[PDB]
A paper describes a structure:
The type VI secretion system ([name]) delivers enzymatic effectors into target cells to destroy them. Here, we report the identification and characterization of a [name] phospholipase effector and its cognate immunity protein [name]—an outer membrane [name] from adherent-invasive [name] (AIEC). Enzymatic assays demonstrate that purified Tle3AIEC has a phospholipase A1, and not A2, activity and that its toxicity is neutralized by the cognate immunity protein Tli3AIEC. Tli3AIEC binds [name] in a 1:1 stoichiometric ratio.
The Tle3AIEC-Tli3AIEC complex structure could not be solved by SeMet phasing, but only by molecular replacement when using an [name] prediction model. Finally, the 8 complexes exhibited a reasonable geometry for a 3.6 Å resolution with R and Rfree factors of 23.4% and 26.8%, respectively. Tle3AIEC shares the classical core of an α/β-hydrolase fold, with a β-sheet of six parallel β-strands in the order β2β1β3β4β5β6. In Tle3AIEC, the catalytic serine was identified in a short loop between a β–strand and a α–helix, with the sequence SHSQG at position 265. The Ser265 hydroxyl moiety is implicated in a hydrogen bound with the Ne2 atom of His574 which is, in turn, hydrogen-bound by its Nd1 atom to the Asp377 carboxyl group, forming the catalytic triad. A cation, probably Ca2+, is observed at bonding distance from three acidic side chains from Asp444, Asp484 and Asp573 and the C=O group of Asp377. Notably, Asp377 C=O group participates in the binding of the Ca2+ cation, whose function might be to stabilize the catalytic triad geometry. The catalytic triad is located at the bottom of a crevice ~30-Å deep and ~20 × 15 Å. The core of Tli3AIEC is assembled in three stacked β-sheets of 4, 3 and 4 β-strands, respectively, with topology of β1β2β3β4, β6β7β8, β5β10β11β12. The β6-β7 Tli3AIEC loop inserts deeply in the Tle3AIEC substrate-binding crevice, without reaching catalytic Ser265, however.
Numbering used by the authors:
A (entry chain B): 58 to 272
B (entry chain A): 38 to 96, 116 to 205, 210 to 220, 223 to 332, 350 to 521, 558 to 656
Write the structure that this text describes.
């Protein structure tokens, strides 16, 4: 109909890998929508990664990948606004994986069907290594204890570019004979970043309000 | 490494619904284990934790993951993931235009006919869909759903002649699946006598679960969003055969006798009910209880063809007196509601609001047109509920549930390839909106309208809710007085016997083993032969 044009906020970083590489959210009305782009000032990269806000991912992310051609970023749906809410199966988060620098994008689904896509991220750790990426889903109640580890590695035999490596659990002595329950618990301080950033952050003050359509 | 014992407090059997493969299983399991861990003071490596199963993948096209434990995913969980469904015969596969998939996850209508049925026994996980029912006798019906001239709707299908509503196969696969469940329960009690058996059912699966109760009742029964109806609606009159139109007194007596059969097991040799929680409430022995969980936004159970106990629960009389079934089933029958602007798990209330939800919004999420309101009519004026269920330490405030009834996220026109509609790709997760699409689509007009933004139907909202299981249902579960250090491979054998893809000869060959109708299931037909003509004449118009 006679739609009014929307105003977007200015681009702001939501996950700073280091000085040169960082994830910027832009073209957005609030911190729960917009798009997230991968930026590398040295290589002058500015390519789109998610068609949604990366702030929805409330888990932890550890970027150890030194490659600007392999990118993996968690695609998380919004609990308050998503077409799969109420559906008889629910929603399923995923990871957007590109192996060409960002031009061709693919989606690898993870996790279980839920009615709270953001609420599931609060229980997840994600490592982005040069050779792929690992997802840790914590079980139990309180604390981040007793995880299940899912590993994805580069392959040229699949459209995504990655395939699950059964030989995971190399985070903790790769010859430790993993049991049925699974390493209670696992230490990731060897992956802790130098800048001490793990969660996605957003500054609501830059969200542009607009007092339009008085009637 | 530190290897601790299991010591589970009673087994739990998840019973899924129609065209369902236990989607809510994983993360009802996670939440319920966390709730039990807080309720019973378990901590550290001693606490319970959920199992983790292999997810799906592409081959592309979606494939349901193999029902196998992931590497290092076996956790301390008392959940037995039951499964059931319908398989086609060895020579009668495509007589019923219904979705069909093999174990590997291939669409029957996507392979050449000569290759089809070479291998990969064709079936559908959870039974067709247009085949639900609102009574137990219809599970033994020799006759399936007939589409000939709103009847049996189940979302995942356009609204506002007869697309996907092909004539359904006979309903023995319901009763047979119930017999399997009644086997497993009795089988458990043979192997394990001093433990607790809990059945946790959803949708049509409630009937299957209820039928197993009339054969071998468990120590606890939970029915979420049940299609059980104590009165025959006009649609029930026009659709079901004369043999399967059950009187009001008979349906009420059937339910009451099932609750009594379950309540039989409330006396065992003596958790410790000598325990008061951190919020000053007394821990409760929930042996022999039967719980009815309802959702007032259920687009399937609130629809005029059903209007069942999974939606309105046990409503109150015209003068406020509680439902007549409460006195019938005794003091072991409880009811809980989960809707917007409505506390769940609070202090029991006499006339809990149903028709007036208390926030100005209409009862039905975005239901305005005459046809929409004819399919989902508003509940009767001033309908009320009794919530006789106990209180929990951390109940759900009505403000927490002010956002619980979902709606159209965006009902604008769709582009065709990049949008949020049935057969599209979620532009965010790069994953299809609804996966079942492929196993269903079988000029472009019709297939070009395969972008109908399916209206969210609050059917899976109740079982999937992490808050509801962790803070309410966890305390609603019964716990045996003497826990049992559990068995290594015995429990895995139970899970193998539960998954019909691993033990049901009906899946391997097709040999249905239909159990006889138990005495608790009444077949008293109401004098409705004439009344069927009354509703039939109106359809002529
Ligand atoms: Ca809704």
């Amino acid at each position: 109909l006679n739609v009014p044009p929307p105003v977007y906020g200015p681009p702001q970083v939501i996950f700073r890998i280091d000085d040169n590489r960082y994830f910027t959210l832009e073209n957005y009305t609030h911190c729960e929508n917009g798009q997230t782009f991968y930026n590398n000032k040295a290589k002058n990269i500015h390519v789109k990664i998610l068609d949604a806000s990366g702030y929805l991912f409330k888990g932890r992310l550890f970027w150890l990948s030194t490659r600007d051609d392999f990118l993996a970023f968690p695609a998380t749906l919004n609990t308050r606004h998503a077409s799969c809410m109420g559906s008889n199966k629910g929603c399923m988060n995923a990871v957007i994986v590109t192996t060409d620098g960002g031009k061709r994008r693919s989606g690898v689904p993870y996790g279980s069907y839920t009615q709270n896509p953001t609420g599931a991220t609060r229980d997840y750790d994600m490592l982005v290594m040069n050779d792929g990426f690992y997802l840790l889903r914590y079980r139990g109640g309180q604390g981040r204890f007793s995880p299940v580890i899912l590993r994805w590695i580069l392959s040229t035999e699949d459209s995504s570019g990655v395939v699950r490596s059964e030989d995971a659990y190399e985070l903790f002595r790769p010859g430790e004979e993993v049991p049925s329950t699974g390493f209670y618990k696992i230490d990731l301080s060897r992956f802790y970043p130098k800048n001490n950033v793990m969660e996605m952050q957003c500054d609501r003050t830059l969200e542009p309000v607009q007092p339009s359509e008085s009637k | 490494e530190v290897q601790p014992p299991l010591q589970l407090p009673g087994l739990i059997i998840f019973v899924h619904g129609v065209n369902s493969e236990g989607e809510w299983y994983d993360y009802a399991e996670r939440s319920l284990c966390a709730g039990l861990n807080q309720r019973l003071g378990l901590e550290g490596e001693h606490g319970l934790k959920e199992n983790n199963y292999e997810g799906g993948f592409f081959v592309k096209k979606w494939v349901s993951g193999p029902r196998k434990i992931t590497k290092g995913g076996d956790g301390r969980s008392p959940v037995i993931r039951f499964y059931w469904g319908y398989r086609a015969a060895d020579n009668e596969t495509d007589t019923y235009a219904i979705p069909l998939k093999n174990k590997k996850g291939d669409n029957y209508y996507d392979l050449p006919p000569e290759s089809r049925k070479a291998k990969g026994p064709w079936f559908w996980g959870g039974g067709p869909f247009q085949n639900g029912c609102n009574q137990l006798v219809s599970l033994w019906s020799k006759t399936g759903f007939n589409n000939n001239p709103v009847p049996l709707p189940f979302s995942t299908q356009v609204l506002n002649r007869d697309r996907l509503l092909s004539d359904a196969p006979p309903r023995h696969y319901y009763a047979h699946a119930a017999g399997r469940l009644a086997k497993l329960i009795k089988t458990i009690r043979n192997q394990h006598p001093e433990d607790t058996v809990t059945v946790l059912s959803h949708s049509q699966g409630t009937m299957i679960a209820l039928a197993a109760a009339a054969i071998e009742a468990p120590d606890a029964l939970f029915v979420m969003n049940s299609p059980y109806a104590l009165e025959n609606e006009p649609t029930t009159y026009i659709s079901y055969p004369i043999k399967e139109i059950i009187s009001r007194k008979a349906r009420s007596a059937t339910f009451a006798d099932i609750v009594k059969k379950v309540a039989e097991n409330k006396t065992r040799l003596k958790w410790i009910p000598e325990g008061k929680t951190h919020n000053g409430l007394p821990e409760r022995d929930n042996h022999g209880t039967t719980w009815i969980y309802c959702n007032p936004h259920d687009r399937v159970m609130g629809s005029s063809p059903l209007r069942s106990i999974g939606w309105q629960g046990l409503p109150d009389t015209k003068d406020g007196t509680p439902h007549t079934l409460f006195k019938q089933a005794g003091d072991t029958l409880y009811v809980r509601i989960l809707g917007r602007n409505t506390p769940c798990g609070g202090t029991p209330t006499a006339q809990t609001h149903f028709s007036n939800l208390g926030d100005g919004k209409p009862f039905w999420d975005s239901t305005t047109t005459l046809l929409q309101r004819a399919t989902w009519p508003d509940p009767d004026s001033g309908q009320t509920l009794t919530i006789n269920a106990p209180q929990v330490p951390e109940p759900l405030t009505a403000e927490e549930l002010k956002n619980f009834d979902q709606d159209y996220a965006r009902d604008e026109k769709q582009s065709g390839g990049a949008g949020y509609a049935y057969g599209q790709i979620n532009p965010e997760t790069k994953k299809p909106v609804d996966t079942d699409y492929r196993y269903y689509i079988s000029e472009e007009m019709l297939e070009e309208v395969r972008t109908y933004v399916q209206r969210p139907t609050d059917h899976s909202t109740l079982p999937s809710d992490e808050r509801f299981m962790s803070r309410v249902v966890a305390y609603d579960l019964p716990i045996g007085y003497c826990w049992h250090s559990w068995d290594k491979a015995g429990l895995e054998e139970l899970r193998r016997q539960a998954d019909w893809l691993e033990s049901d000869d009906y899946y391997f060959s097709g040999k249905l083993t239909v159990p006889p109708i138990p005495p608790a299931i009444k077949q008293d037909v109401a004098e409705d032969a004439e009344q069927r003509k009354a509703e039939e004449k109106a359809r002529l118009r």
